[PDB]
Symmetry: C3
Subunit: 154 residues, 3 copies
């Protein structure tokens, strides 16, 4: 009895592992994940950068990062409105880096940006990045609430 029951429960567990994997695949498909490509998701909520970062982390993802003009456009389509990107110069002013580390290999800065402007009156300069109309980028205060868009691996 005991060992037979144990061997079965082992099979039951493996079966559930398989079903959950299938469930995740179906969910990814329904969320718009294209075959073999990274995908973006949002709940359309606006919040400060630290909050977006913490939320995406909780979902085992990261703040959306465009690596080319295609993904940049993709992020816009998902967000609809301006959203934070996983890029900041919080560590060293003027040196933007991906929140996952490393220098930028692609950028789409609006003319005259980034400028670390203080005039937004929120205190401090601007160490965060968000997409604006036309898909261009602007550095803004990490305190401003922008649409949370998380990214998940291809």
């Amino acid at each position: 009895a005991i060992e037979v029951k144990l061997a079965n429960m082992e099979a039951e567990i493996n079966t559930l592992k398989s079903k959950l994997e299938l469930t995740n695949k179906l969910h990814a498909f329904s969320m718009g994940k294209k075959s073999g490509k990274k995908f973006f998701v949002t709940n359309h909520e606006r919040m400060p950068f630290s909050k977006v970062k913490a939320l995406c982390s909780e979902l085992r993802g990261t703040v959306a990062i465009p690596r080319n003009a295609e993904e940049n456009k993709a992020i816009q389509e998902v967000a609809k409105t301006s959203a934070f990107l996983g890029i900041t110069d919080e560590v060293t002013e003027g040196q933007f880096m991906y929140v996952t580390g490393g220098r930028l290999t692609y950028s789409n800065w609006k003319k005259d940006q980034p400028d670390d402007w203080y005039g937004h009156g929120l205190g401090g300069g601007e160490d965060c990045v968000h997409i604006v109309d036309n898909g261009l980028w602007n550095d803004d205060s990490c305190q401003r609430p922008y649409t949370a868009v998380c990214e998940f691996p291809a």
Copy 2:
């Protein structure tokens, strides 16, 4: 050693339940659940109140109930049409109560509502409530089909 095999399987179960929790969080996120806020969702199907209660119950949720103007708007945006709210005055005519218990603490009645006539016995008249396009409330028969919207805890 069966005790070791048992211990390993218990560990496997905990890993799976953690992954399922993650799957659930990501799904809610993808469907618009805001941080710290209740999650409202619909399949856009119209049915009698009794069917809505059973359906939401089967999903471990309840018929949507707006406790404030913000939530009222969130429900309105999810339904996009006329949908039932988890509120009824079946015990005492005119005294609306939440299906989950308690007296109303917020309402958004249309000027001439509720307009149910007095004197109806059990099941007679208008003892159910539905929200409309603009977010206003109307009382109506629980047998009339309206959009099913369920809510899940924050």
Copy 3:
């Protein structure tokens, strides 16, 4: 303690099956699954027919098949653009059948279709079927990429 632990593990497993079923049910609901009706999902990706078949198959579903007017409208609703249907005449030119077997019954052909056209130049005639924006059908080359739409059981 061994037998007590095994009993608990059995309960842990069944509660996991229960919660997984709940996740699948809520997901279907959020995707618009109507009670007692099969539902449709798409990631909005366009690909050749063979890729759609394989993709839906991996998800435990199949290429969407409109069995009546209602399902046809539901499919164009989810697709929002031209998509393949699970109907072809690969087995016998001129006589269509469902990818899951059986002769085609309900159809919504555009005037002068199907015509097994060779003018497209991709080589061969047209053995696949796709629905257009207005919901009408046309037979086209299985080699052409169209939106991937899967259906899952009622």
